[PDB]
Design a protein around this nucleic acid. Sequence first.
RNA 1: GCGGGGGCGGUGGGGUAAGCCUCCGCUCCGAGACGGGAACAACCGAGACCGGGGUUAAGGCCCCCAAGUGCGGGCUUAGUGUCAAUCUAAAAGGGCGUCCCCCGCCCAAGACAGCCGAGGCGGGGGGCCCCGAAGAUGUACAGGGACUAAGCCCGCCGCCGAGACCCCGGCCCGCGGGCCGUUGGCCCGCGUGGGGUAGGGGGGCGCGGCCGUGGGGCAGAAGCCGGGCCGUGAGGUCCGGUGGACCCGCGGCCGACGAAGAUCCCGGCGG
RNA 2: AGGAUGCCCCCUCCCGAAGGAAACCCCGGUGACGGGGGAGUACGAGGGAGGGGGUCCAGGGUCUGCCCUUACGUCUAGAAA
Lengths: 90, 183, 172, 169
Amino acid sequence: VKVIDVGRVVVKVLGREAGRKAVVVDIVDENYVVITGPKSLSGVRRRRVNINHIEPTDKKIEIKKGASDEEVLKALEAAGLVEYMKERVK
Amino acid sequence: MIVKKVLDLSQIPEKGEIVIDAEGHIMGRLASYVAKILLSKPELRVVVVNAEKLVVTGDRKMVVEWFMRKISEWRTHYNPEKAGPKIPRRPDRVFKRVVRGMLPKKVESGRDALKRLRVYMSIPLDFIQRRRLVLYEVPAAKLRVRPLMQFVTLEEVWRSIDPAAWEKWNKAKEVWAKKIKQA
Amino acid sequence: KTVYPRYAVIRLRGIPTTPGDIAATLDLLRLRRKFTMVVVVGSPSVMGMIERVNDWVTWGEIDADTLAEVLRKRGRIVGDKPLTLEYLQKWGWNSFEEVALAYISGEIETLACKKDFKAREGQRPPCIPYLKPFFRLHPPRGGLNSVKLHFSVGGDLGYRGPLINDLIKRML
Amino acid sequence: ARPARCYRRIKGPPYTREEYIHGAPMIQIPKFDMGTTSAAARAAFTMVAKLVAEERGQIRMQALEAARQISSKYLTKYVGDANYYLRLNVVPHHVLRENRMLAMAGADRLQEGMRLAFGSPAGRAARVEPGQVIFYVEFKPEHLAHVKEALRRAASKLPIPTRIVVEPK
RNA sequence: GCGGGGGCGGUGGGGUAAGCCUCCGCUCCGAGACGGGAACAACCGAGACCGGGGUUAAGGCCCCCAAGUGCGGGCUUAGUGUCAAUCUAAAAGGGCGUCCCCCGCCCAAGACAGCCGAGGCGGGGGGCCCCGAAGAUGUACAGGGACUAAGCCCGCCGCCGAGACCCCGGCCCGCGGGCCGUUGGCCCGCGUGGGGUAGGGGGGCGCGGCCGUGGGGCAGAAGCCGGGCCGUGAGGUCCGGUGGACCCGCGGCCGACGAAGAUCCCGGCGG
RNA sequence: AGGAUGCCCCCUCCCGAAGGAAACCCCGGUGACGGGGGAGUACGAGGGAGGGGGUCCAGGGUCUGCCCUUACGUCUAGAAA
Ligand SMILES: [Mg+2]
Ligand SMILES: [Mg+2]
Ligand SMILES: [Mg+2]
Ligand SMILES: [Mg+2]
Ligand SMILES: [Mg+2]
Ligand SMILES: [Mg+2]
Ligand SMILES: [Mg+2]
Ligand SMILES: [Mg+2]
Ligand SMILES: [Mg+2]
Ligand SMILES: [Mg+2]
Ligand SMILES: [Mg+2]
Ligand SMILES: [Mg+2]
Ligand SMILES: [Mg+2]
Ligand SMILES: [Mg+2]
Ligand SMILES: [Mg+2]
Ligand SMILES: [Mg+2]
Ligand SMILES: [Mg+2]
Ligand SMILES: [Mg+2]
Ligand SMILES: [Mg+2]
Ligand SMILES: [Mg+2]
């Protein structure tokens, strides 16, 4: 059973930006959520994503629903995951 | 010891033998992978352990009545030991019949591929006492558990259609379980 | 006086089992083999013919640039020899694009010269002399959508618009 | 009498001109307009129920009459004839034929098989299109449940599927 | 040749219906290879000189089997179903079983069910599924395995996949032109040229003899057994063994002139 | 009586029809994937040259593996029947 939560850090497993870390910033429906790198940091453009196409990591950050990329950027300073989000999987 | 691993469908070894732990896998979906593996690697041997832990989706009554019809109503009126079907009941032999169904028929390629397969119930002791038991899983063939979903293991099917044969094997598990636990 | 549109017509379906009247029109349109392409002028008599063979062909407005590459890649002259730039320059045509632009823009009315055309001296003919009036294309790269359904329902057949140039690029 | 499935499908031209048809059967439907048919009385009613056909087909004259009695009897004893007007809208003009070896039915009926296979008159039917109105009920809005029940009863005696449409005049 | 047939369309006309009878038109089979359809003349794709390479059509991509355990959303619990037809099916009728659309009314917190404080009641329709739904050699049949998707509905992405289309090499053909003393031979050009039964037309191979011409054979002719090479082929030719006296190349001509079959004839010989 | 001036392997070079990638960078889509570059590139039927190694090659008998495949003659719309 997979849990996607707002502010959770996930890794894409499909598309061009697979193996890249992204941050959940909003939930569209029960099937789609909104993820962002931020781009300047991982290259994950601020789009929606299917829940089937992302895997949740063990890290998380606290932010508001629909948090901005600068808002996402600061909370990466809150827990210091800036180097973690730069990593590419596999 | 036993090291669980995930099977690389592209990095399948060509020589030797692989062992697949069948617990939690779907019988038809794992049989499809096993049949293609044996065809694509003509020199490789495949071993499936925990064959009684294979899973068939659907209602228990529906699956058991399906098996009951096979082992009851499927017969011949000619010489039965010369021309009739011989239907397996044991979970290891049941799984080996599905792979034979998915292999090519009436050819040496199909005949050799099934000979290169061994299916066991639970884990054999000579496999357990090896230095490093590398087991494998096929996640595509694994069953995703959901609430209110129906399925039965092959062992439950076997106990329905052959309770006395099942009872002896279950008793044999309890007899040797102290020795098996040592390894 | 009227510059009718220039259309590309490609035969998508085959010879065996085609109805007789549709087969007769496809022969008169010179689409006598599968994947044959002709370039016509969209006169009212021409468009009535294409309407007859709508369920066997696809067609659309051909552009000058696509026709230029089509001429270079698949153009043939008598003897089935390839159409080269030297042959064009010998007849007063400097480039493939210039001859393709003139036909598409309406400066000339036909691409291949007629059977009865009499070659002159010095004067540039209004066509390409002895060019075969049909092109034999390659099957399309990446396949098609459906050769039995219309383009308007997600198939292939029928009026395609300017997307006939994309198919021609895949069929060269 | 053969099953109605033998005569349901429309398989040929209509056979109605009775000056050319020998021994064409008479229509055995006694009445087509039930209830209060006078236009002065029907202004009391304000609702219209229609038993509309769903498939094109042929409805035998005996099936039309059978639906007519069961519907009209129900409205007679549940609604009173002064409180409704019920009309059977179609007339069975089409003459049904049958090819069977029989008694004195013409000299050419004595030849068995498909030789001289043009049948003799075997009944009448109405040829109906989809959306055709079979039964037409004018009634008041208090008896809407009863009229639907009577129309549903009439539908059970008909060979093709039908639906009830209720609209005001 | 004057026996036709398949599919589709005229509610063709007839008939309960029929793989039924009798007309009208296109196409296909007969007389057409090949891919798909599980097999299958005529359903879908497609039209095949020979070899090779490539790309596609129909259709398919979990295994059998080349290509996806491909992508998003929803429905089904019945193994229902499992991508048109031939081809193995299903009706009227019942079901808020389940998902959904709409309409009427009550509740203005005094709605329904038994003071409580949030929705309630009724009607029509749509999707899927359940009942209706019973058979004779052998399993949830309609390819099998099996599958809870590998089913169904709305959309989408790539790929596999013919002899078809593209390309290369070789071959042959039709027609036109030219050359050579020619009952004929050779070369070139062009062809959206290359299936084919009955039948029509054009050339060649073989067998026995004859008119000519040139030869071989006791240092081994014909015949027979095996083998190499040449020719698309009918066939030719050579080698080794056996045999013991005839035979062959080329031009022309002539026939008692070519066998796999006739419940063929004669002989021999088998299980 | 055929080739052995052969045949196969490797290596190297060159030309090369139709066709034709990949890694990696950039643009887009939830996505399967599409596009610009890489790149008409590596490659590609076949056609030339050379070097080294080996020894028979072609052909024949028989068997095995994979792919394909419904005796013949005949009437017939239709023959494995
Ligand atoms: Mg028993
Ligand atoms: Mg035995
Ligand atoms: Mg067709
Ligand atoms: Mg009729
Ligand atoms: Mg006749
Ligand atoms: Mg016909
Ligand atoms: Mg015949
Ligand atoms: Mg087939
Ligand atoms: Mg495969
Ligand atoms: Mg079923
Ligand atoms: Mg019926
Ligand atoms: Mg021919
Ligand atoms: Mg002679
Ligand atoms: Mg014969
Ligand atoms: Mg005899
Ligand atoms: Mg004997
Ligand atoms: Mg020699
Ligand atoms: Mg016969
Ligand atoms: Mg017959
Ligand atoms: Mg025969």
